[PDB]
């Protein structure tokens, strides 16, 4: 559900074709206004914890805005999530799994990693069962669980005079609502 | 825990946060006024009208 969630917010780079018509509002807004050079939502996983969030690269006058759109998208997904965009989120992930396991090296990685982490290799049918399981309510219940009213770990490097204050970032991690 | 049980169900949402404040304030007003009235009335025992009202009133 968190992979589906990160797929809805998606990822953008200035070399992308779609630009203003992109599905994920953060990319659309970032493309139209030209807020950032790139952003990427990640879910880094470890044994009993991880890092769920996002990364962006932008002009020094665009940090507050990018942050505002990004957190706006998190809060939105926590509170309100359309069935259509979640289906897009699923399909992006469906395509991601099958795209990634093509060639032998990614499959050999998947095996070697799976047995150390998951314990067993997980079939694509099992993954599909868990993707098909996810609907709009699940995304909201899960996004809101991990992101709503939670202190986030923030890392800023470069011309970051605009980077919002932690209290203001922390205020953005819940809504008005 | 004690305080987490309040957070979890009573004021995680900002929607219920306000409902808690409003209802809590509604009760607080009754509680505090009543208490501080009684404290002031015990502080000033026998000197106010309500203490000496029965005195000059057969009705």
């Amino acid at each position: 559900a968190l992979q589906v969630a990160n797929a809805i917010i998606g990822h953008y780079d200035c070399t992308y074709g779609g630009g203003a018509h992109l599905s994920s509002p953060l990319a659309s807004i970032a493309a139209t206004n030209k807020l950032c050079q790139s952003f990427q939502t990640f879910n880094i996983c470890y044994a009993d914890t991880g890092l769920l969030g996002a990364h962006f690269v932008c002009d020094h006058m665009s940090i507050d805005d990018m942050m505002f759109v990004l957190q706006g998208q998190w809060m939105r997904l926590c509170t309100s999530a359309t069935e259509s965009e979640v289906l897009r989120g699923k399909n992006l992930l469906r395509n991601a799994l099958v795209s990634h396991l093509d060639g032998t090296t990614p499959v050999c990685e998947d095996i070697g990693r799976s047995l150390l982490t998951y314990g067993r290799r997980i079939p694509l049918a099992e993954w599909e069962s868990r993707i098909a399981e996810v609907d709009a309510r699940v995304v909201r219940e899960v996004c809101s669980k991990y992101f709503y009213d939670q202190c986030p770990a923030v890392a800023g490097f470069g011309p970051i005079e605009q980077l919002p204050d932690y209290n203001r970032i922390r205020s953005g991690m819940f809504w008005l609502r | 825990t004690l305080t987490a049980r309040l957070y979890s169900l009573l004021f995680r949402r900002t929607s219920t946060f306000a409902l808690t404040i409003v209802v809590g304030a509604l009760f607080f007003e009754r509680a505090f006024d009543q208490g501080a009235d009684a404290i002031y009335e015990h502080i000033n025992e026998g000197k106010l009208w309500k203490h000496i009202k029965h005195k000059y009133e057969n009705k």
């Binding site: 509170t79 309100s80 999530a81 609502r177 | 929607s15 306000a18 409902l19 409003v22 304030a25």
Partner: peptide, 22 residues
């Protein structure tokens, strides 16, 4: 959809608050 329980809760907040103040 999702603002129905929120707007109902704010509807209560407004209702009980207006009752509180008067």
């Amino acid at each position: 959809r999702n603002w129905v329980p929120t707007a109902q809760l704010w509807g209560a907040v407004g209702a009980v608050g207006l009752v509180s103040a008067t």
